[PDB]
């Protein structure tokens, strides 16, 4: 019969005099300290049952997975999305997307070899403009998100971009300042107050102008794309994509149509550059600011390894030391706090509470990654949090950035692989010096909220 507990709300703003929106994460935790893991919070008239720590999470997505597998609001990409595309529908549609694309992706390679040689070239690339900088001091952004976004970007549009491209440049502008602007205290703010906010000036219409910018550039290949179409031989997801729309134009109630194709297409190319990107800048810094850490990498790659050979993906199960530290990376970078949204479906029943049908859902990500049951010193960086005694990888039933349940990131199994063979060609060919001290290095996250963005910083990279 009843919502679970939480702090007295107003009406419309709802509990907005108890959430710091520069701190959102922080706030709700500190409301958890008092109310216990599962409560309510308003976000202004949206009704929110929060889940903390491990314990609440898992029980709501794994074991009655099924209730929670809806999808809640992000208000930013929803101006946008509105509900179309796998990401951010529900029922039926994200069912038959997410299937889709689950199936698409194993066609292209994803997990096998033609995707890790795609990789292991596209990192090449990457060393060679490394070495074209002569260990000046720059800023690695857009070095990373171009290698990064040239990887998806093969899958969806069937070709990498070229470098130098004025274009390809413009649209990782529009992702980042997209993808950051939900972290600011505006972005939160948004998520509560879209409904006024959408209608005004501020941070938020360069937010909808850029994410307006990326819809322009994925509806024209579209377009492209279907003007050489050749129904027997895919050259990218977009064929595949409107070849299923093709063999599907006869039912009525398809969930393929025009619309889905330009929002899932941006899914990809958005999700997959993006997350990865931002894992690896803040995975550089991290190291810098600990460079006895830096070099057992380093000592690692040396020995199984080489100066000769391209690093392969299976190099990861002799490399135990190197994958705990990709995975306290993750497990420090918190990527998205707060998860995605979720919703319950039906009316359901979840430990001595009722959430009706329709209710928000924030499984909150961020507070599994720092579960002091799980992980012995939360707050520090510190690779022997996936370490035996032995020096054996362990894993963790806490190590949840990618999710859990049922729409848990089907862009594991590549963003894995691309961290993997990211990491580890890099620091092959190059060790990291910044203008600044390890002690002094601010490893604390610059803005917090929908996502964790790190600090502006530059470094150098000198051979090996
Ligand atoms: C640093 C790497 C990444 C992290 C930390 C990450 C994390 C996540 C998280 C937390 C979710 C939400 C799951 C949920 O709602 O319960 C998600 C979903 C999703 N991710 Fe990733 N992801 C990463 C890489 C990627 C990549 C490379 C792709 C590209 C294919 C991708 C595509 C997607 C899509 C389409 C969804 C929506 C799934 C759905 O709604 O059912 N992600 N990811
Ligand atoms: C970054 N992502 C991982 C989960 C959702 C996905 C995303 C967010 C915004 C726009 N497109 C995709």
Same mark, same amino acid.
């Given at each position: 019969?009843?919502?679970?507990?939480?702090?007295?709300?107003?009406?419309?703003?709802?509990?907005?005099?108890?959430?710091?929106?520069?701190?959102?994460?922080?706030?709700?935790?500190?409301?958890?300290?008092?109310?216990?893991?599962?409560?309510?919070?308003?976000?202004?008239?949206?009704?929110?049952?929060?889940?903390?720590?491990?314990?609440?999470?898992?029980?709501?997505?794994?074991?009655?997975?099924?209730?929670?597998?809806?999808?809640?609001?992000?208000?930013?990409?929803?101006?946008?999305?509105?509900?179309?595309?796998?990401?951010?529908?529900?029922?039926?549609?994200?069912?038959?997307?997410?299937?889709?694309?689950?199936?698409?992706?194993?066609?292209?390679?994803?997990?096998?070899?033609?995707?890790?040689?795609?990789?292991?070239?596209?990192?090449?690339?990457?060393?060679?403009?490394?070495?074209?900088?002569?260990?000046?001091?720059?800023?690695?952004?857009?070095?990373?998100?171009?290698?990064?976004?040239?990887?998806?970007?093969?899958?969806?549009?069937?070709?990498?971009?070229?470098?130098?491209?004025?274009?390809?440049?413009?649209?990782?502008?529009?992702?980042?300042?997209? &993808?950051?602007? @939900?972290? %600011?205290?505006?972005?939160? /703010?948004?998520?509560? !107050?879209?409904?006024? *906010? #959408? $209608?005004?000036?501020?941070?938020?219409?360069?937010?909808?102008?850029?994410?307006?910018?990326?819809?322009?550039?994925?509806?024209?290949?579209?377009?492209?794309?279907?003007?050489?179409?050749?129904?027997?031989?895919?050259?990218?997801?977009?064929?595949?994509?409107?070849?299923?729309?093709?063999?599907?134009?006869?039912?009525?109630?398809?969930?393929?149509?025009?619309?889905?194709?330009?929002?899932?297409?941006?899914?990809?190319? &958005?999700?997959? @550059?993006? %997350?990865?990107?931002?894992? /690896?800048?803040?995975? !550089?810094?991290?190291? *810098? #600011? $600990?460079?006895?850490?830096?070099?057992?990498?380093?000592?690692?790659?040396?020995?199984?390894?080489?100066?000769?050979?391209?690093?392969?993906?299976?190099?990861?199960?002799?490399?135990?030391?190197?994958?705990?530290?990709?995975?306290?990376?993750?497990?420090?970078?918190?990527?998205?706090?707060?998860?995605?949204?979720?919703?319950?479906?039906?009316?359901?029943?979840?430990?001595?509470?009722?959430?009706?049908?329709?209710?928000?859902?924030?499984?909150?990500?961020?507070?599994?990654?720092?579960?002091?049951?799980? !992980?012995?010193?939360?707050?520090?960086?510190?690779?022997?949090?996936?370490?035996?005694?032995?020096?054996?990888?362990?894993?963790?039933?806490?190590?949840?950035?990618?999710?859990?349940?049922?729409?848990?990131?089907?862009?594991?199994?590549?963003?894995?692989?691309?961290?993997?063979?990211?990491?580890?060609?890099?620091?092959?060919?190059?060790?990291?010096?910044?203008?600044?001290?390890?002690?002094?290095?601010?490893?604390?996250?610059?803005?917090?909220?929908?996502?964790?963005?790190?600090?502006?910083?530059?470094?150098?990279?000198?051979?090996?």
């Amino acid at each position: 019969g009843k919502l679970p507990p939480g702090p007295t709300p107003l009406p419309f703003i709802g509990n907005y005099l108890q959430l710091n929106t520069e701190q959102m994460y922080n706030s709700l935790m500190k409301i958890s300290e008092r109310y216990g893991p599962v409560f309510t919070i308003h976000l202004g008239p949206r009704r929110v049952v929060v889940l903390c720590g491990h314990d609440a999470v898992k029980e709501a997505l794994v074991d009655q997975a099924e209730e929670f597998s809806g999808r809640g609001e992000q208000a930013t990409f929803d101006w946008l999305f509105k509900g179309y595309g796998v990401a951010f529908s529900n029922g039926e549609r994200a069912k038959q997307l997410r299937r889709f694309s689950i199936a698409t992706l194993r066609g292209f390679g994803v997990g096998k070899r033609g995707i890790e040689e795609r990789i292991q070239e596209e990192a090449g690339f990457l060393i060679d403009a490394l070495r074209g900088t002569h260990g000046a001091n720059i800023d690695p952004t857009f070095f990373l998100s171009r290698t990064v976004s040239n990887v998806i970007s093969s899958i969806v549009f069937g070709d990498r971009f070229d470098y130098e491209d004025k274009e390809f440049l413009s649209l990782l502008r529009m992702m980042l300042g997209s &993808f950051q602007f @939900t972290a %600011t205290s505006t972005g939160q /703010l948004y998520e509560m !107050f879209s409904s006024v *906010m #959408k $209608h005004l000036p501020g941070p938020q219409q360069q937010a909808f102008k850029e994410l307006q910018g990326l819809e322009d550039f994925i509806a024209k290949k579209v377009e492209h794309n279907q003007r050489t179409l050749d129904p027997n031989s895919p050259r990218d997801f977009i064929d595949s994509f409107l070849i299923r729309m093709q063999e599907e134009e006869k039912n009525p109630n398809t969930e393929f149509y025009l619309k889905n194709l330009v929002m899932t297409t941006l899914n990809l190319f &958005f999700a997959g @550059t993006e %997350t990865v990107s931002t894992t /690896l800048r803040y995975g !550089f810094l991290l190291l *810098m #600011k $600990h460079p006895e850490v830096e070099a057992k990498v380093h000592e690692e790659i040396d020995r199984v390894i080489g100066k000769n050979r391209q690093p392969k993906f299976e190099d990861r199960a002799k490399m135990p030391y190197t994958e705990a530290v990709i995975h306290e990376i993750q497990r420090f970078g918190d990527m998205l706090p707060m998860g995605l949204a979720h919703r319950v479906n039906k009316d359901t029943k979840f430990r001595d509470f009722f959430l009706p049908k329709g209710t928000e859902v924030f499984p909150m990500l961020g507070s599994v990654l720092r579960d002091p049951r799980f !992980f012995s010193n939360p707050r520090d960086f510190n690779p022997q949090h996936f370490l035996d005694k032995k020096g054996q990888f362990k894993k963790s039933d806490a190590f949840v950035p990618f999710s859990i349940g049922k729409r848990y990131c089907f862009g594991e199994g590549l963003a894995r692989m691309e961290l993997f063979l990211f990491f580890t060609t890099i620091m092959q060919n190059f060790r990291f010096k910044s203008p600044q001290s390890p002690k002094d290095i601010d490893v604390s996250p610059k803005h917090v909220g929908f996502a964790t963005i790190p600090r502006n910083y530059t470094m150098s990279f000198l051979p090996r």
